[PDB]
Amino acid sequence: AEEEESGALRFGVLGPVRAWRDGETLATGSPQQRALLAALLLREGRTATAGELIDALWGEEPPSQALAAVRTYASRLRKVLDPGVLVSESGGYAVRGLAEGALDLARAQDLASAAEKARSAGDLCHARDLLRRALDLWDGEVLAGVPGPYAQTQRVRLGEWRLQLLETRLDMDLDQGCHAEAVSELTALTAAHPLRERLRELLMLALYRSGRQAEALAVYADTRRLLADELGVDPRPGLQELQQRILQADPALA
Template sequence: MPRVGTWEQGMGGLRIAALGPLKAWRGEQQLAIGPAQQRAVLAALTLRCGQVASADELVRDVWGSEPPASAHVAVRNHISRLRTALESESAAPKALVSVAGGYALHLPDGALDVSRAERLYARAQSARSLGDLEPAVRILTEAEALWEGTPLTGVPGPYAQRQRDRLMEYRLLLVEARLTLELQLGGHTRVVGELLTLADEHPLREGLRALQMLALYRCGRQADALAAYTSARRHLAAELGVDPGPELVRLHQRILEADPTLAPPRGVAAAAPAPGPAAGPAPGP
């Protein structure tokens, strides 16, 4: 479908949050965006970021492959109500428009929390490439704070579920990027507890497991780091029928050999062994 440009002005301060319960504001006023199916239509338009969605696409987004006979009428009614909810009488140009046989939602720059998270991640990557690790950590922390629980909480439909999964995965990408920088800065004692929790929550993510093993090792907990690898191998075999990837295998071997290159960065004091349980289940890349 064609893409419609973003409107930067004239929306009366319209803002939408999708990284938690779906919410909308105009200025400081929170808007009533209607019942569950209407929210599903709004989510489908919002997260297309200006792309046009046909009526057929919106029907599939909300009801899937077996919509009721009244689905197209329902979409038109939801669009009409959303226009009333989102647009002030003085708003020009309009936010929700009919284009090329479908509908598009125009938002000002920075008006969608998902877009702000993506821009912050890009800024953090740029800072990291310049060697500015501490600013990059702060920027990633700011991006993570945009999540207010599960994205699109309570919004029904297959499109919302796909986006919910994508946005939760994206948050993990930000978290993993931040924790990687924290370890590069010598913050192993500060993040080891968080990594233990994440390992339990995401036992198939090998990238998080590698960070956890490194943090444990740098905290003087070599046995726990090795136990984390064993747990990773067990979970991967049980859930996916595969062995750990080559990077995790190499890290395990380096920890066995007490590879001196695994030590904290220069200038960071070696940490005393931190008390705590052995590592739990294993995360993946």
């Protein structure tokens, strides 16, 4: 609310496709139109040619004469957004005029870099506040209802980035002395995603000092059974090592 300046046009990709024009919404339109606007939004303002956008929306088999289709999608964007916010060069399309804080993705990289800098500087309160602001950026599933295998690619990429971001958040929560909300979040995420080894290692680390041992190794045994049933291999050596040092109960990491 403190960064809501006059004339600000805010764009959002981490949650669904929406536009905020000084507090009032804009109709982003068709799902393919939403995917087109998102594809322009991921490229931080390239002039990207018509064939590349056609491939981004659809992939291997776009209809043959659908170049005029993308043309009229561009017309839709130009009449629903500002005339000058979208400009065309040599047949390519480009959204400019994006200030700081206009895109939630740019704010996400900014907050991640600030958290990394604070971790390098050894600060904890400012980094915790930065990642608290960062976890409020995503709203539900990223890229809600957009077609295209391209959109699937940045969907899985942003999901993986969110996974490492929450891994770092939970890790600093564990090292600074937070366990209750930590184990709550880890249990919720392992309920959501059952086949991540790193989050279950985080479960072991969090429960190891919060006063919980039986269900931690029960969850580990369930992980071993599912990983043997679905993969039939052995887990990472760092895991077995973490369970090992746990077993002799070293109070060094208290």
